[PDB]
Amino acid sequence: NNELEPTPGNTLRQTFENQVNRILNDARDKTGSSAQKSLSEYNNFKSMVVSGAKGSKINISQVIAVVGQQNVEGKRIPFGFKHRTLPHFIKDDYGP
Amino acid sequence: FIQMSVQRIVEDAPPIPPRYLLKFEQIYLSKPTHWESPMMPNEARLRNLTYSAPLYVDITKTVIQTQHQKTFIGKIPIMLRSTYCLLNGLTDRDLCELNECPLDPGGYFIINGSEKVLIA
Amino acid sequence: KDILCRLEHTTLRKVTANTAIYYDPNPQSTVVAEDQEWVNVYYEMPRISPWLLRVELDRKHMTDRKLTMEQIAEKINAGFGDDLNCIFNDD
Amino acid sequence: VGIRFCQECNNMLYPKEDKENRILLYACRNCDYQQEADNSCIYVNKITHEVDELTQIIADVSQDPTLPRTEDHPCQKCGHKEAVFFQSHSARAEDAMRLYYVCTAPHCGHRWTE
Amino acid sequence: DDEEETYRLWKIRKTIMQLCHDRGYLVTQDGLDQTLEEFKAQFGGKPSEGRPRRTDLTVLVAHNDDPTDQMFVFFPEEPKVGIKTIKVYCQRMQEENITRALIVVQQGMTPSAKQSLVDMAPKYILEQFLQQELLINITEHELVPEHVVMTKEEVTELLARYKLRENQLPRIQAGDPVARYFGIKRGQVVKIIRPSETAGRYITYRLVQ
Amino acid sequence: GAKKSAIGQRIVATLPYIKQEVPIIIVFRALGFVSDRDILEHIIYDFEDPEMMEMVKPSLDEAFVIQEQNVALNFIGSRGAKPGVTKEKRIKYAKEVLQKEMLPHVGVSDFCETKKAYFLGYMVHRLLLAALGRRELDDRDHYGNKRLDLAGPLLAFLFRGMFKNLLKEVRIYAQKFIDRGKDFNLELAIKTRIISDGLKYSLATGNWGDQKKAHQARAGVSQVLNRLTFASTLSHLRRLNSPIG
Amino acid sequence: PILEFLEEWSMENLEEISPAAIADATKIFVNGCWVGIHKDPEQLMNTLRKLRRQMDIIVSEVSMIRDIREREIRIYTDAGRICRPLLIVEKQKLLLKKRHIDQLKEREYNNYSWQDLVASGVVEYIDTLEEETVMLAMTPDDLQEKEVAYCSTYTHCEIHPSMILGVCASIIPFPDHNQSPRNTYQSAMGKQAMG
Amino acid sequence: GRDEAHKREWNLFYQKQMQLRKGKDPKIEEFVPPDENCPLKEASSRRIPRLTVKAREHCLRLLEEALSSNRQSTRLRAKAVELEHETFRNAKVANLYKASVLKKVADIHRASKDGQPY
RNA sequence: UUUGGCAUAGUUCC
DNA sequence: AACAGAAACAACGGGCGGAACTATGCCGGAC
DNA sequence: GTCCGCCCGTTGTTTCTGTT
Ligand SMILES: [Zn+2]
Ligand SMILES: [Zn+2]
């Protein structure tokens, strides 16, 4: 609806992509925090993460809650086909 | 390739006081044989041979006509299990008789015993 | 923002809107009807070539950099000397 | 603006100056064919060039199966409900996400942008 | 504009005053510290068709150890200084019995003039400084540690103490910005005093060569 | 400079077997089209496109000199692989190149100019569309813009050269045996070793080409079959390769 | 045969065309060679696809692409194009039916096979640059059904989405619960196991 | 270095084209001195090339007519002469002098439209 | 108790 | 007018990870 | 037993001003 206003120093595409990536990162981090704080005192992932042996809270988050966004060359997945990522999507689809 | 491309390559080749002219007409391919006699792929593997078939051609000689049939111009390697191999269409019992694995997929050449695979 | 303006390169293309080359030998009867009044005012109180170089400056970019048409005119005079003529409208 | 061609040699007509009648003449370099033009403007250069694609959008895009469709935007002319839509589909556009619409009713081909 | 030209002249004068103070010459505090309005009042606030015309701003000052050894700071009025201008300046130096002089240039000097400056080196010493190179004092930049020019006595003592031949010191080019600022010839040794992260201070030495 | 700054962009074509670049209008005239109206009919399909017309105008401003097919052919042929000492031979070489090596897929017969002009106009039109930002530039990594050379194409390309060499050898033998005028034989004139050894060597070593020129020959075709496991065999038999370094 | 059918189906040729009747016509390319123009691209494409599905004049291997925006029709008979089979969705229902499934599951002593499935116009071969004008559905009984409308114009359907994996990666169990480098490493190490 | 080369090439091209447009005898327009009734400050000043006394007198009349129209709206010679003299003193070239006078005239007319004394 | 080399391909580990 | 100092552009050449383990083809041709 | 794919340090070429 053209109601989005550009951020100074950024293009319209850049500001839209920044807002989308920020929302998705907030979602991934919130789900990760929920997964962390819902663990138990006998959990072996927690045993191997708290002691610093091997693993990380991001690995626990990806195992339990959400794998997260996939990026290519620092940007979201590009439009390999004509204006769409795969033949299973309509053209010009910017959903998550 | 064997059905069409070699024939097209032969045909598209330009033909080569008294005058002499030559013109190659068409080709032929027998099943693979050994010259010292069909040669089975397992024998080709064991004896370090090459699994191949001879390619003939009709050549016509004219002076300014005389026809030469089945002119031997060389041996062309044959891909296993292809239409021009000795294992094409055989059943599993025949494959076992020839000491060939019925599960072998085929699609490779036997050059001096070793098995070669072309890479796309 | 003033220093930001001072430290960033900017040619005329960054602010121009459109340009065109006309053929208008008549100082009074001008092919373009917009310039009539002020071009007549300029010519009434004084050779030249009959050709023109009319350019149009984008208002948004003109007012963003805090630029002034007098400043553009004096820059043109410095860059080309008095062998050009320049007449400019106002905002 | 546009290119105009001589009727004798069919070559491009360059502008030439008539220093007697203070008039503009279009003349070619092959023959001596002259003309008088109505544009009176040799050259035009717009650097904004924010061309509205409604001139460049074909009405035949309505047969694309890969395009999204909506029924909340009825056609202005024929009142048809279903209408395909897409984005600018233009390179060398600094910034644009505006939608464009094409009516899917055959022979209507109305192409607007709300 | 006239304001900008006055500002540039004032900044160049202030930097040259600082340069002379660093080089050991005798410049007073009031001369060192002039406000823009004071400079406008003293020597014209209007440059174009005004009293300051890149002349009468020339500075003659005597070294703190010898009033006989003095230096000039000339302001050519020509964007491209020429052979005849250099000859005029050398004539003025000869008549005033002055050995060293600085020359601030509007845009640049022709290579012929630069070579005609180099040729008379034992007779006279003249240095070229562009107008852009003096709008700032490079010494005041925080990336530049303090430099001290060392006397031949300090050099000898240092070499004897560390048992070093001058080949074995770090070097600094005679075209270096700070070297030109201090007016150092080949064979002189500068001392660098800078704070350190692991010791608290560290004194280095550089040979001009 | 002033003239380059006013011209802006010009369109040039790099024809094969020619020393350096040629402006496009020169090639179109060499095809036999003289009028700017006809050339613009071949290039700009819809004349109600002033931006395209203005874009192509500087290319036509290089036609101020050349106006005829003969001189255009001369200009094209001046830059051959070996520049001639005469002019008729140079013009014949130019015509031969424009008839044999420029766009072979359109046609090679005598009357192929009417279609070569259209295809070259299409190339120029697509270039203009790319320059105007109306179509997306292609990417080499898109897999619709790729082909795969399997055993058929590989062995056919290999066999063309060997059959050509066999023809050369039989020709040489025939000429040598016929200059005497005595007689001529066929079986003695054919060296089967050429074809047999060539195919066998190329399959045995993997250097796809003749043995004498195994320097630029692309190595890595015809590997020896993996037999460690059945999965290894299958995944070897179904394998691709990108010739990128 | 494709050129002959094009001539039979009212396709004006280049040498018989005035340069004014080309702006509103869609160019036809066959093997990258511009052969003519046409004025009814939609009906032409419908007829060509019907002929390819019947397997009458055009072999199943040939691909046909229509660039709707740029008004071009490209037909390839070339060798080396890579293609995979896809199911056909006509309106919203697969053309594959329970009768086909039963005739397939009685495959022995019935001489009904994949060729007889292809000849019925049920499945189709789609190469890479024909996939750019197609709308695919990953699963029939999940994506054809009535939902909140995402796409109601599906043109094909996937046989099974797990057929995107190669020979060595078809042995990994639960590859969708793994990490991609781990799947790659197993694809490497599957060629070194001893059996 | 490429920008400097292009700027030199442009300057040579421009100077060549302007020399082909310069006639052999550029008639130096004779400076006619002010008349005894000339109300201009520094009327005999030749500081601005090609600016005549009659041009400055015309520019002064435009300022007077504008100020007269403004005063009639809000219910003058000395002020017009000061406005002209300030504009003269600040201008370096005749075209900028004329433009700065016309700007002052436009500003006076804006004040009159707004019902404000200039 | 005596010693070939050149090239190409594949694989292992960071 | 002749000479000389300095600079813009163009062409040319060298440079590009570390180890390790298997295998296979080939080392000149006619007379 | 005889003949047959990208970067950037050097050096050149050419050009453009200054001196006498
Ligand atoms: Zn004409
Ligand atoms: Zn409608």
XYZ file of N, CA and C (backbone and C1' of nucleotides) in Angstrom, chain E residues 80 110 112, chain K residues 18-20:
30
model
N 51.205 29.822 -10.003
C 52.336 29.012 -10.442
C 53.595 29.855 -10.297
N 56.496 25.059 -10.841
C 56.968 24.326 -12.001
C 58.227 23.533 -11.649
N 60.919 23.292 -13.275
C 62.077 24.150 -13.498
C 62.360 25.008 -12.273
P 52.556 25.592 -16.989
O 54.148 25.520 -17.086
C 54.932 26.653 -16.739
C 56.392 26.276 -16.572
C 57.371 27.433 -16.746
O 58.476 27.300 -15.854
C 57.786 25.803 -18.411
P 59.266 28.603 -15.340
O 60.768 28.350 -15.823
C 61.020 28.002 -17.175
C 62.503 28.047 -17.491
C 63.079 29.441 -17.652
O 64.464 29.464 -17.312
C 62.916 28.357 -19.787
P 65.280 30.848 -17.337
O 65.926 30.885 -18.801
C 66.799 29.842 -19.218
C 67.207 30.018 -20.670
C 67.615 31.443 -21.055
O 68.846 31.435 -21.769
C 65.919 30.656 -22.522
